[PDB]
Ligand binder design. Sequence first.
Ligand SMILES: COC(=O)[C@H](Cc1ccccc1)NC(=O)CCc1nc2ccccc2c(=O)[nH]1
Length: 352
Amino acid sequence: KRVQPCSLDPATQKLITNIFSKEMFKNTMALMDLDVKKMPLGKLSKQQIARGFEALEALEEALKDGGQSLEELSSHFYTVIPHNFGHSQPPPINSPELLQAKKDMLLVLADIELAQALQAVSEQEKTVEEVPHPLDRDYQLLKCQLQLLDSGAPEYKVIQTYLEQTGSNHRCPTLQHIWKVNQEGEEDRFQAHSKLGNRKLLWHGTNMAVVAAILTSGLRIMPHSGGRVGKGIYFASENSKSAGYVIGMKCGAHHVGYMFLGEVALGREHHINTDNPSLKSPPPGFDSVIARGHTEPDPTQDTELELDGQQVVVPQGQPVPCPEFSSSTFSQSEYLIYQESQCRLRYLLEVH
Ligand SMILES: COC(=O)[C@H](Cc1ccccc1)NC(=O)CCc1nc2ccccc2c(=O)[nH]1
């Protein structure tokens, strides 16, 4: 079986190496305090996660009797999903906060498993006498087009400022590479929202073990997903807010982190200053709910872009106080869309 040469550039070789690394997914599992010696990457199945979520479904009903205890039902979740706690008694899930924390850990594992199932060798690849370079195979597996952009691009100095001015003042993410993303299948669903305006290019931060799943499926509204403002996709106009979720992985003296830039079609937006986890969609006549923050990049330093004949607002300015929302329960803005079709990824960033 002849191994074909790598057609990808060094930057795209790194990206694919990182996001598809077994060590990276195993390390992401170690950080989520999961026992990788009792739950290996290859043993990780859609049945085990279903069971895990089923065990959290039973716990959720106990907080909201006569049945089993909170210590008895927690014990089963730990028997299903094994954690490394130094061989000591596990703690019971006794709050909505811990419930969603243990729900958000299974939402990462689902993408860790997805990427694994994605890398399965088809019988078409078996009846074929030649194989592509492993990196080129993984790149083909995403069914996504990543275009590495240089300094001499209309959108390079646009995104550079965006990252600088809205990124944390002292802990500034050092930009390395920008890939223009084009997901095949995500084009038409967003094209339907042509009637819906108020287009804004907004950040989205994730840990390295879900990057590939987003490069294959796009950004989703998963069953058992949620947070401070409900079952929608979370976007920040400030880079600092998104970068909190990006766990930096060590690589010599440097740290690796990958960040997304989605195109959010908001339309008639409904603002808020209080947390509402119970949300599943916006109020009628509205298409997006935005949790307004204490600070915001001054909408006077804003720029625009023409992505597929549409005008996308790009915030370029530094955060500024917002007296209309001076008493908001959110320090920084959070943008929520309640239908996947209203997003389309536009850029993948490499930050150090
Ligand atoms: C591994 O990916 C993550 O870090 C997790 C949970 C999650 C989400 C999707 C798939 C898997 C896991 N969270 C996100 O992708 C969203 C994180 C995020 N939350 C925000 C909340 C408010 C405002 C902005 C953000 C944001 O930019 N990213």
